[PDB]
Design a protein around this ligand. Structure first.
Ligand SMILES: NS(=O)(=O)c1c(F)c(F)c(SCCO)c(F)c1NC1CCCCCCC1
Ligand SMILES: [Zn+2]
Length: 253
């Protein structure tokens, strides 16, 4: 999988045609304000980043999730979700790259901060539960630079190819958040195989702005390993999937 794009994944993972697949188009006019959504709590003051890795499909920054350092709580969530890693999906052009869309609009990229429900003890147990993960999704549009992103961009040359990693300590993910925490939420899935339906998605309404030069540097990563023909790492997003009977709730309006 990666002739092997998202339209093929159902043959190995039949849940690809399931009832709670992600991403989805967020129709802002049909999302329902839910005044009962409890306040969202993003507590990242003790986050401990470890490493950055080129997985062959995207890059990710991993955290020490062996204690409750950085956690997500509140909003639609019951209980405590620990930050495990963040990663991005992005496009070959500035008008595509996000996984979720808003009124059919695609953004240049989307940041996913992935958290697992600590009641399940480990993330591998959490991924087999309907409420195992909470992913905070943040859109990226191209405009002014994002200062809090530059440390990540500057390390990408050291993880150009599949399977490279590098130390990535002391990175503060708070620098990647927009001002507002207004959000939409809905039940969905992972967006790559095995596509399991274990995610409570929380998608922030306010995008962050990143510079043309920052996203250009995402696009110089490679899907291939070292010493293999170069395939630029672009368009690593899954398109919107049918919403089926689901309701998207809004925390605002
Ligand atoms: N959008 S997403 O969160 O489904 C996601 C991808 F689309 C990916 F393409 C990747 S890289 C391929 C899987 O190793 C990914 F790590 C995650 N997240 C991981 C989160 C950590 C543990 C849960 C398992 C899913 C992979
Ligand atoms: Zn993702």
């Amino acid at each position: 999988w990666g002739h092997n794009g998202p339209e093929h994944w159902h043959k190995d993972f039949p849940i690809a045609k399931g009832e709670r697949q992600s991403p989805v188009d967020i129709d802002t006019h049909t999302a329902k304000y839910d005044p009962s959504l409890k306040p969202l709590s993003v507590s990242y003051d003790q986050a401990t980043s470890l490493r950055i890795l080129n997985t062959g499909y995207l890059f990710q920054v991993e955290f020490d999730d062996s204690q409750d350092k950085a956690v997500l709580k509140g909003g639609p969530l019951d209980g405590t979700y620990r930050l495990k890693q963040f990663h991005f999906h992005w496009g070959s052009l500035d008008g595509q790259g996000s996984e979720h869309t808003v009124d059919k609009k695609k953004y240049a990229a989307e940041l996913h901060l992935v958290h697992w429900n600590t009641k399940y003890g480990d993330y591998g147990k959490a991924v087999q539960q309907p409420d195992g993960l909470a992913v905070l999704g943040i859109f990226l549009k191209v405009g002014s630079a994002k200062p809090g992103l530059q440390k990540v961009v500057d390390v990408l040359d050291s993880i150009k190819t599949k399977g490279k990693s590098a130390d990535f300590t002391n990175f503060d993910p708070r620098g990647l958040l927009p001002e507002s925490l207004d959000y939409w939420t809905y039940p969905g899935s992972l967006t790559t195989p095995p596509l399991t339906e274990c995610v409570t998605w929380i998608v922030l309404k306010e995008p962050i702005s990143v510079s043309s030069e920052q996203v250009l540097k995402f696009r110089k990563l490679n899907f291939n390993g070292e010493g293999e023909p170069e395939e630029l790492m672009v368009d690593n997003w899954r398109p919107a999937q049918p919403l089926k009977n689901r309701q998207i709730k809004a925390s605002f309006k």
